[PDB]
């Protein structure tokens, strides 16, 4: 059996592929001359999936879509005080105003537009780093979420370099109040050549998913970026990747995205998807027209939305089984506050220790245990009570696959209360993932 | 034992507590002169429980807490082609600009600001709606999702209704591009009396939680609002509920929230939490001080973000085993487009049917596939490669439901055309579907 997904984006493909609206980016040759009968997508998922259609597999200069990426670079090498200084999290559009570095924050509004994004690259490796350890740190960590070595297109870098005032008199703006201690030169040919790093829509997409899985390369399940970073990224990608889009992309479309000039489009939904799209002709925001309209299809076709609680929850617990006096507990899943916070309840439902007459209607409910927390989603821990002396309770962490700090810190917690209630608590941990 | 989460929260009460900076709404007695000295917080979470310290149970007026209930009452009352022609989902703050509403759609910004939020009133209904038909609709969207009768704070009303020349102001001006079609002065008294609404820091956080579970109260389990309408509402919420706080809201918090003048703040978390906090006492931009820094500090210690990817994932597959000819394979979790997709590569990876080259890194991972799905999130999809790695075809796979707590018509559909196509293959499924759940 052949997976349906890709046969939906092949699908997708065909249909959204049947016109071809806007133009392509016309203030260089190398693009504007570019084929505009092109569209591909690829869904890189945290399965270590990769499923595509289309041109998924032709090069093109990501453009903007590489701000996200330099951005966690920055966060990476300087810590994030030293980026924060230099660039703002106000969400804006492009059009430049000298207020918000003369007054306001006294810095680029963000990370996504270019002033940001100049101040991003000057950010890099470190204080006093050189042009050529910037690119390579630039190219660098695109290369590493990617999971191949990426090249820069120099004929597509020197064309954009010839038609630079814009940024270069950016650049010189930021130098002026601080933010830039280089060149204006220096900052915006690292910039430019930053824009024209040759990758594909499976590559975007495979790059989107390691921001969208927290930090971690869903084909190595190798942490890449701290989560705390991959956060960050993605915010500042929800608040302003779309900022010029018709209508309001979070309410509508829902998933952080960002777009380059060149026709791609850079997707990433937490804990689901990484997103690469490819179409060459531009509307007039100046995003790819179809890049964007697959998107929206996405999100409608799949009911994708950051919006959407789809989370572990009680479903950390697999099950709870009891034998005379000894309770099994079985936790699983990738527990973090929601998952551990489920645990504690199965815990305290074992009696090893709101008014019902306001609410009677959540009397009966509760009274339906199973039923409630199948609408509820609340896994199996409504065992625990249906287990509930009790005067051994062994905790299995083998079906867990991660867990967070603070779940350990709050199961450790529970493991010590339940103790502290004359209960024998034997942790069966393989893998050792709770200390 | 006594659960964690409600001690934290006491310490957490005592800690904050130790000091009350800012001052009370000074716009109307009532308000100034409130005893400043409380200070409570709840949570509400999916699985029906709520974890509670402090003055958690003290009434207060939810002023714009009520914003985000009347616009899902004027989704669900007169569907979103219809709201959103008078209601924007442009970001903003509460100063008025008479430009926005230049615009050709002729619309506030959006619902959480008060020119919004007056234009949210004027829909509750329908087109031939009465003032005390509309105030009766507020009253009770805010009371089926606390889940109890709510009652209005009428000192309150009175007192506010006093002071209300900007609220007036911003209704005659949308009068004046068609956006209310009753008095400046019908709108601003329901509206005000929509915020004179009384509730507890624990009314809040079962309120957030329906909005949070996208639309299911963690209670009854009962549907109280289109999932739709929900995820707009804490879409809004999320780009101007906090648009004045000091930082970036979404990026240093990522706790969808909205303040209220009496001190009450509103919090919702997509698929983990309601948030209830209330501390009289505002700072300078408006906002409840403590109830703020109480949400900065739920979001750091417990590392709560609406960024986070904790999905179910590949956990959608609770395990594949074999038995010779036949496959068991039981799903479980709450099924979307997420779970779904893991469990169509179950499906797909029993074999009934990138360049390794280029990443020798993936292909050494995806050797040692148990470690690659601990390390990722897969759960037990894994098992099904496992199963099919030598020795006879599958002839039957026993599909079973049984520990799916529920699905979305998207994993409905994804997972009924994988079945189909397992079945071309001529293998024999049979769902074992005890609550029928995969139907429609």
């Known amino acids: 059996m ?10 997708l493909v065909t249909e959204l592929g049947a016109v071809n609206p806007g133009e392509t980016a016309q203030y260089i040759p190398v693009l504007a001359e570019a084929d505009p009968d092109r569209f591909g997508i690829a869904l890189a998922t945290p399965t270590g999936r990769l499923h595509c259609a289309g041109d998924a597999d032709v090069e093109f200069t990501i453009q903007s879509a590489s701000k996200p990426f330099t951005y966690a670079a920055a966060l990476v090498d300087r810590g994030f005080a030293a980026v924060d200084r230099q660039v703002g999290l106000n969400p804006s559009g492009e059009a430049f105003n000298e207020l918000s570095l003369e007054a306001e924050s006294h810095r680029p509004d963000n990370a996504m537009i270019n002033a940001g994004a100049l101040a991003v690259h000057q950010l890099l490796v470190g204080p006093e780093a050189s042009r050529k350890e910037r690119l390579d740190r630039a190219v660098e960590i695109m290369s590493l979420l990617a999971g191949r070595r990426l090249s820069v297109d ?4 020197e064309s954009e370099m010839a038609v630079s005032d814009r940024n270069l008199s950016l650049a010189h703006m930021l130098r002026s109040y601080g933010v830039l201690q280089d060149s204006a030169e220096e900052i915006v040919a690292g910039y430019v050549a930053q824009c024209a790093v040759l990758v594909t829509v499976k590559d975007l997409a495979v790059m989107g998913a390691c921001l969208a899985t927290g930090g971690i390369h869903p084909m190595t399940g190798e942490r890449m970026l701290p989560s705390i970073v991959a956060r960050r990224v993605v915010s500042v990608m929800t608040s302003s990747g779309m900022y010029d889009a ?3 992309w979070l309410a509508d479309v829902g998933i952080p995205a960002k777009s380059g000039v060149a026709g791609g489009v850079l997707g990433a ?8 799209v490819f179409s060459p002709r531009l509307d007039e925001v100046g995003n790819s027209a179809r890049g964007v ?5 996405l999100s409608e076709d799949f009911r994708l939305h950051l919006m959407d609680g789809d989370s572990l929850g009680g479903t950390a617990v697999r099950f709870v089984e009891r034998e005379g006096d000894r309770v099994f ?7 973090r506050f929601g998952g551990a916070e489920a645990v504690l309840d ?6 090893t220790g709101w008014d019902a007459a306001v609410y009677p209607r959540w009397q009966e409910a509760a009274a339906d245990r199973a039923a409630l927390s199948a609408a509820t989603g609340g896994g199996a821990v409504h065992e625990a009570a249906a287990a509930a002396p009790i005067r051994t309770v062994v905790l299995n962490l083998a079906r867990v696959d991660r867990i967070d700090d603070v779940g350990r810190r709050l199961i450790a917690e529970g493991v010590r209360r339940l103790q502290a209630d004359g209960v024998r608590v034997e942790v069966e941990d393989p893998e050792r993932i709770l200390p």
């Open 154 to 157: 120099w004929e597509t870098y």
């Open 346 to 351: 199965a815990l305290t439902d074992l009696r």
């Open 2 to 11: 052949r997976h349906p997904i890709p046969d939906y984006l092949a699908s």
């Open 246 to 248: 018709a209508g309001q």
């Open 329 to 335: 507990l079985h936790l699983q899943g990738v527990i």
């Open 293 to 297: 309209l697959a998107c929206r299809r």
């Open 269 to 276: 939904l937490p804990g689901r998807v990484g997103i690469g």
